[PDB]
C-alpha cells in the first residue's frame, strides 16, 4: 500500500516529530499488514499512549491515539507511620513521579509495591487504594489511601536443645530482640558450653500482619583444663596465683575469666602501672573436650589535675573533699576506688565514672577525671487519722542548694491540733565520723482543745542546732542547743495548770479565760539511740531503743528537765520470720528544778493508736479540775465546763485529759502472717495481737488539800487494752486497723475502739 499522506489524531504532549520516525512506516513508503503490527507495537512501545489504532484510509495512513494521563501530583492519606516524602521516594524509584505519564495497568503493581514496602515497620499486611482523579487537559492526580494496621507474638521455641528442655530455658513488647539473644547465648556459656553456637534465628508468620513465631536454632560440649600465666609480671607472681585459683570440676565460663583478667589488671593498677594489659587465648582441645586457657599479662606516678565535669548544678568547690588522695601528688589506684563510692553515697548526682588521661608533654604525669551526672526533690503528703484528723504535710528539698553542700528542707505540717512549720539545713557527712548539723528554724501553733485536752493555746517559735556523732553503726548519739519562745494564751482555769503558773511566779484570775504567758527558754538536748533491727520497715528481729533528754540551761525563764525512753524489741519464732513477738515500752518523766514545775505544754500523754489502743488520744492520765469561771461566749442549751453562769459555785471534777509529768506505757504484741493473703504479696501485710498497758500521773499533785478529788499522784491505776491490729501497704499509702477493747479503764477515760491512719507521697 502506497502511503502519500500520514496524519496523527489525539497528539497533545507528544509532537509530530517524535511519532513521525518512532514508527517504521513513513510518507512515500509501501505498507503491508506486517508493518501494521510493527508500527502499532512500536508506537505502543513509545510508552506514551493510553491506546493506539494505526490504519489505512483510501490513500491516507491515519494514526488514532490517546495519550497517557500525565501525573500532576501524588497525594497520600492514611499513612500515619511512613513519611510522605519517604513514600514519594519509593514511588520515584518505581517509575511513578510527577511529570511522568502513568500506566493505568501498573496501579495494581504500584499497590503490591507500596504494600511490599510497608513491611519496613510492624504492618506486615494493609490495603493501599488508588484514587486516579482526572484533571485539566489530560492530567491526573493519583491519590493513595492507606489502610494501615499495626505485630504480634506468643510462641518462642528452641530446636537442637538436648541439654535443656525448652520450658527450662523459658525459666528466665517484642518488636526487636538483640541483647536478649546474647543473654540466652550466655545461658549456655555459664554452664560450660564454650563450643556453643547459634546457627540461625527464624521469624515465622501467620496470614495476618498480627501473628509472629520465633524459632532459634542451636549447635550445643566442653570444660576447663587449666590457667597458665606468662609475661612481665612485675614480680607480683606470688599474688597472681591467688587470683587465678581454680576449683576441680570447673565448667568453663568466659565472664568469670574476664573478672580475673580485670582483677589482675586492677592489682597491677593498684601498684602504679597505668595501663596493665591482660590477654587470654584459649587452646581448644577437642581430643580432651576441654579448653586450656593461656593468659598473657603485659604490665606497662603523679597527678597534675583532679578534674570535675558534669557538675552543672553543684559549684566547683563542694566536691573538693570526697576522696582518699590529693592533687599535685602520687597516684593510688586503690585510693581512687576507696573514694569512688563517696560521690555516689551523697545522692547529689545520678551516674559517676573515672577517666585517666596523660598530661600534655609529660612522661609520668596523669590527670584523673571524675564525671558526675537532679537535686530538687518535692515531697507532698495528705492523710486522715484519729489523732491528726485531716493532716497536710509538705517538704521542699534541695541537696546542693546554690552549691553549698548543705541540703535545705522547708517542711510544713498541719494536723487537727498543732500546726508546724520548719526550715532546715542539713549536712549528713560534715566530718570524718559521719557527723551531721541538724540546723532548724521553726514555728508551732498548738491548740490543746483539738488535741482532746483541757483548753489552752500555745504559739511558739525558736531554733535548734543538733550535732549527731556516730559510734557503732548500731549506736548513734546526738546532742545540741535549742532556743524556744512560748506565748501561752486562752487557758480555761484548772487546778493543775494554775499550780504550774504559781510555780513560775505568775498569778492570773481563776474566774476569767483572759490570760497570757510569755517564756523564753534555752535548752540543752541530748539523744542516744541504739538500733539492731534487721529491717527498718516491718522488722522481724532485733531491738531499738531511744533516749531523749531535755534540760533547761540557766537564763531560761523555765527551769525543768524531761527524759523519755522508747523500747522496741522483735523476737522471731519461726525459721522463716513470719511469726514474731514484739515488746514496746515507753517511759517518760520530767520535772521542775528551781522549786518550779515543768510546763503543761511539755506533759506526757497516753492513749490513741500511738500507745494504748482502745482509748481516745491523750485521754489517759490526770483529768482537769476546773475552777468556777465566767465563760466569754456564754450561750445556754450549750455545754461548758464549770461555768458560774451554768450554776457553778465550787471546783469541778472532769473527763478532759491534761496529761502529766510521769508516764509509762508498755505493749506486748504477737505478729503473725495475715490470714488469707498469698505469700506473693504477704510481705506488705502485718497482722498483730497486742496487749497494751499504760499510765500517766502527776508527782506534783496535792492529795491532802483536794480530798474530794482523785489522787492524780497515784500511778497504781494501770490501764490495759487488748486487741487486733492490721497494717497494709495499700496503693493509697500506709495503713492500720486497730480494733481494741480497753478492758481496764479508769474514771472518765474515753474509749475509741476502732482506730486508723493513711498517707500518700
Amino acid at each position: 500500500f502506497v502511503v502519500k499522506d500520514i496524519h496523527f489524531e489525539g497528539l497533545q504532549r507528544v509532537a509530530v516529530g517524535a511519532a513521525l520516525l518512532s514508527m517504521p512506516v513513513r510518507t512515500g513508503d509501501t505498507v503491508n499488514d506486517e508493518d501494521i503490527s510493527n508500527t502499532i507495537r512500536a508506537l505502543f512501545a513509545t510508552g506514551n499512549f493510553e491506546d493506539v489504532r494505526v490504519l489505512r484510509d483510501g490513500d491516507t495512513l491515519l494514526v488514532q491515539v490517546k495519550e497517557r494521563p500525565t501525573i500532576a501530583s501524588i497525594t497520600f492519606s492514611g499513612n500515619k507511620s511512613v513519611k510522605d516524602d519517604m513514600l514519594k521516594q519509593n514511588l520515584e524509584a518505581s517509575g511513578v513521579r510527577v511529570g511522568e505519564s502513568l500506566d493505568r495497568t501498573t496501579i495494581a503493581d504500584i499497590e503490591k509495591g507500596l504494600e511490599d514496602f510497608y513491611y519496613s515497620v510492624g504492618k506486615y499486611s494493609a490495603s493501599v487504594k488508588a484514587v486516579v482523579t482526572p484533571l485539566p487537559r489530560n492530567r491526573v492526580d493519583l491519590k493513595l489511601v492507606f489502610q494501615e494496621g499495626v505485630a504480634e507474638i506468643q510462641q518462642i521455641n528452641i530446636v537442637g536443645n538436648h541439654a535443656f528442655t525448652t520450658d527450662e530455658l523459658i525459666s528466665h513488647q517484642k518488636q526487636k530482640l538483640a541483647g536478649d539473644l546474647e543473654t540466652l547465648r550466655s545461658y549456655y556459656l555459664d554452664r560450660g558450653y564454650a563450643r556453643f553456637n547459634i546457627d540461625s534465628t527464624q521469624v515465622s508468620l501467620t496470614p495476618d500482619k498480627k501473628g509472629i513465631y520465633v524459632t532459634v536454632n542451636i549447635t550445643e560440649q566442653y570444660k576447663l583444663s587449666g590457667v597458665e600465666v606468662s609475661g612481665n609480671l612485675a614480680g607480683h607472681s606470688a599474688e597472681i596465683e591467688q587470683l587465678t585459683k581454680i576449683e576441680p570440676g570447673e565448667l568453663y565460663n568466659g565472664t568469670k575469666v574476664t573478672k580475673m583478667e580485670d582483677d589482675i589488671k586492677k592489682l597491677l593498677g593498684r601498684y602504679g602501672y597505668a595501663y596493665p594489659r591482660v590477654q587470654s587465648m584459649p587452646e581448644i582441645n577437642d581430643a580432651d573436650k576441654t579448653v586450656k586457657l593461656r593468659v598473657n599479662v603485659d604490665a606497662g606516678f603523679y597527678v597534675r589535675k583532679i578534674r570535675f565535669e558534669g557538675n552543672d548544678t553543684s559549684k566547683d568547690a563542694v566536691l573538693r573533699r570526697e576522696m582518699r588522695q590529693m592533687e599535685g601528688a602520687w597516684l593510688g589506684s586503690d585510693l581512687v576506688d576507696q573514694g569512688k563510692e563517696r560521690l555516689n553515697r551523697l545522692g547529689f548526682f545520678e551516674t559517676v565514672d573515672t577517666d585517666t588521661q596523660r598530661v600534655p608533654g609529660s612522661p609520668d604525669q596523669v590527670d584523673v577525671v571524675y564525671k558526675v551526672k537532679n537535686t530538687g526533690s518535692f515531697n507532698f503528703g495528705i492523710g486522715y487519722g484519729t489523732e491528726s484528723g485531716v493532716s497536710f504535710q509538705a517538704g521542699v528539698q534541695q541537696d546542693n542548694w546554690l552549691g553549698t553542700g548543705y541540703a535545705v528542707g522547708i517542711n510544713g505540717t498541719k494536723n487537727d491540733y498543732q500546726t508546724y512549720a520548719e526550715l532546715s539545713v542539713t549536712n549528713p557527712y560534715f566530718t570524718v565520723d559521719g557527723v551531721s548539723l541538724g540546723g532548724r528554724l521553726f514555728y508551732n501553733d498548738f491548740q490543746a482543745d483539738d488535741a482532746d485536752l483541757s483548753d489552752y493555746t500555745n504559739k511558739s517559735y525558736g531554733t535548734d542546732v543538733t550535732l549527731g556523732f556516730p559510734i557503732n553503726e548500731y549506736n548513734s548519739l546526738r546532742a545540741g542547743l535549742g532556743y524556744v519562745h512560748n506565748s501561752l494564751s486562752n487557758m480555761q482555769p484548772q487546778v493543775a495548770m494554775w499550780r504550774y503558773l504559781y510555780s513560775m511566779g505568775e498569778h492570773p484570775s481563776t474566774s476569767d479565760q483572759d490570760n497570757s504567758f510569755k517564756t523564753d527558754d534555752f535548752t540543752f538536748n541530748y539523744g542516744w539511740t541504739y538500733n539492731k533491727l534487721d529491717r527498718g520497715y516491718f522488722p522481724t528481729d532485733g531491738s531499738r531503743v531511744n533516749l531523749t533528754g531535755k534540760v533547761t540551761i540557766p537564763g531560761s525563764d523555765n527551769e525543768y528537765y524531761k527524759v523519755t525512753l522508747d523500747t522496741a524489741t522483735y523476737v522471731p519464732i519461726d525459721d522463716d520470720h513470719k511469726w514474731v513477738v514484739l515488746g514496746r515500752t515507753r517511759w517518760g518523766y520530767g520535772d521542775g528544778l528551781g522549786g518550779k514545775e515543768m510546763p503543761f505544754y511539755e506533759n506526757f500523754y497516753a492513749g490513741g493508736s500511738s500507745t494504748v489502743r482502745g482509748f481516745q488520744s491523750n485521754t489517759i492520765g490526770p483529768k482537769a479540775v476546773y475552777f468556777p469561771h465566767q465563760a466569754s461566749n456564754y450561750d445556754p442549751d450549750y455545754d461548758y465546763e464549770c461555768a458560774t453562769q451554768d450554776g457553778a459555785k465550787d471546783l469541778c471534777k472532769s473527763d478532759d485529759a491534761v496529761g502529766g509529768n510521769a508516764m509509762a506505757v508498755a505493749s506486748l504484741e504477737f505478729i503473725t502472717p495475715t490470714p488469707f493473703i498469698s505469700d506473693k504479696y504477704a510481705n506488705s501485710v502485718r497482722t498483730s495481737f497486742f496487749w497494751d498497758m499504760g499510765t500517766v500521773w502527776d508527782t506534783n499533785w496535792d492529795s491532802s488539800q483536794y480530798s474530794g478529788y482523785p489522787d492524780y499522784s497515784d500511778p497504781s491505776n494501770i490501764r490495759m487494752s487488748a486487741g487486733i491490729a492490721l497494717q497494709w501497704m495499700s496503693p493509697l499509702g500506709p495503713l492500720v486497723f486497730s480494733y481494741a477493747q480497753p478492758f481496764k479503764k479508769y474514771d472518765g477515760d474515753k474509749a475509741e475502739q476502732f482506730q486508723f491512719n493513711i498517707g500518700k507521697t
Binding site: 541483647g179 555516689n344 532548724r440 493508736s609 499509702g733 500506709p734 498517707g759
Partner: protein, 80 residues
C-alpha cells in the same frame, strides 16, 4: 537512682534483692519525717549490697510504726 521500670527496658541488670531506708519522728513536737534521708539510707543499704543506682518502688510515710509517731520509709531494689 531509677524511678520506673520503663527506664531500664532492654538492659542487662543483676537484682541483688531488696533494700530499705527510713527516717523516724517520735512525737508531734519533734523533727519531721525526712524522705531524702530515707532515699539515702536505702542507697547505703544497696551500697553494702554494692550497687551504683537503686530501683525505687514507692516512698510512703507510715502512720503505725512501733517505735515512733510518723516514719518515712523508701523501698527499693539494688542493681548492678
Amino acid at each position: 537512682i531509677y524511678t520506673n521500670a520503663e527506664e531500664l527496658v532492654g538492659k542487662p541488670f543483676r537484682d541483688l534483692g531488696e533494700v530499705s531506708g527510713d527516717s523516724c519522728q517520735a512525737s508531734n513536737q519533734d523533727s519531721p519525717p525526712s524522705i531524702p534521708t530515707a532515699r539515702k539510707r536505702m542507697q547505703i543499704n544497696a551500697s553494702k549490697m554494692k550497687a551504683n543506682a537503686v530501683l525505687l518502688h514507692s516512698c510512703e510515710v507510715t502512720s503505725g510504726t512501733p517505735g515512733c509517731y510518723r516514719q518515712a520509709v523508701c523501698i527499693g531494689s539494688a542493681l548492678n
